[PDB]
Amino acid sequence: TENILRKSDEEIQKEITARVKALESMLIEQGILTTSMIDRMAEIYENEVGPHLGAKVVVKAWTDPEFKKRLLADGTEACKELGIGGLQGEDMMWVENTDEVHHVVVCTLCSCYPWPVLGLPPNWFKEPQYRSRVVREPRQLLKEEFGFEVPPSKEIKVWDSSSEMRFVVLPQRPAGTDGWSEEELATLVTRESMIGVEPAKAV
């Protein structure tokens, strides 16, 4: 929304860039930051860690009922079976969508998100518009913003992640996917489906 007080995006970016470079120069001289450290962090979260890891978990639960049980019992330890875990996902609890219950995850006070299974969160998840409203009008938010119609008789459980526990949605397996391989099924799992703002892909 326009704010008559606000500078242009180019001017804000120019100012932030100078401020960041100045701070970067000082932490470099302190010996606590280096160019290789910066490049390593960026490489991991650009090309290594992302929602394809979460998709592997979802498809295993869809095709392995015993794994699904372990996943819902202890999400951290179950994901460890696939070598998935670590920073900002040390404690994970998965919640299962059913015909009777729909789940959606948020941090109203912060931006907490399960990095090992989803990578870094999209900007909208961290911004005040989603965070403020999803705890108050989740049914209307899902419909208006994500085109996702949850019938009024179906319960919506909103998980406001106010601790280091990370909540992840196990979406329902779409109909018409009988006997698909895991690689076929993963094509239907999205980052949005593991937040709860959309279902898994149709067809």
Partner: protein, 228 residues
């Protein structure tokens, strides 16, 4: 405290901005701000709860409309000054230098294998906040409890929309670092952690969805018993 970042339930913040596809990092400065998190953590600037408290002390209008990773920069400076590791006047002079000379080089420095070692270990091994404590959990699944009305000015995880509300304990998770001490420089002082379910009608009155509830994480001091 009771700051603008405590946005749960706030109306009028606008439509969600969701570009059909965006990159992980929108500009080079965001990559730098991101990598400063492990760097300042290792150097003793702050822990994760203190990190949050720094963001919470921002100018609220700047918080509401600035890029997310700018919030990170503000917390590094906050804690850099607090601990005496960042001289503000030198930072201000270097900012002007980089305004006028944006392509000027960064300081000469040696690379440090130990920092790559730290990054790799932190990323794959994590930084777990779970802790063992000598006390047993006060509460258990099915207990009906009431959230505290306390309104501390320091760091806490007590969203205003849940204060004083009645809910049911859903799960005990074990004990964890406690934000009300950790974020204020007072130590881990771990407390048991629970998820508590609040109905939308309890939270929002009649305007609440009759078939929705919010599940909110409560450290043990945040809640007191109503009915076992």
């Amino acid at each position: 405290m009771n700051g603008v970042y405590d946005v749960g339930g706030t109306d009028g913040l606008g439509p969600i901005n969701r570009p059909a596809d965006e990159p992980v990092f929108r500009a080079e400065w965001e990559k730098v701000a991101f990598a400063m998190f492990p760097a300042t953590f290792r150097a003793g600037f702050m822990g994760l709860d203190e990190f949050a408290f720094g963001i919470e002390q921002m100018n609220p209008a700047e918080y509401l409309e600035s890029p997310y990773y700018w919030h990170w920069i503000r917390t590094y400076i906050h804690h850099g000054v607090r601990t005496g590791k960042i001289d503000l006047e030198e930072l201000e002079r270097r900012t002007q230098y980089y305004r006028e000379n944006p392509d000027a080089p960064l300081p000469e420095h040696e690379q440090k294998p130990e920092l790559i070692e730290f990054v790799n270990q932190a990323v794959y091994g994590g930084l777990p906040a779970s802790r063992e404590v000598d006390r047993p959990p006060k509460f258990k699944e099915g207990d009906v409890v009431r959230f505290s009305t306390a309104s501390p000015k320091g760091h806490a995880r007590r969203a205003r929309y849940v204060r004083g509300k009645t809910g049911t304990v859903v799960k005990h998770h074990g004990a964890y670092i406690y934000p009300d001490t950790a974020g204020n420089g007072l130590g881990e002082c771990p407390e048991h952690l629970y998820t508590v379910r609040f109905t939308a009608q309890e939270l929002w009155g009649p305007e609440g969805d009759p078939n929705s509830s919010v599940y909110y994480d409560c450290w043990e001091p945040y809640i007191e018993l109503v009915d076992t």
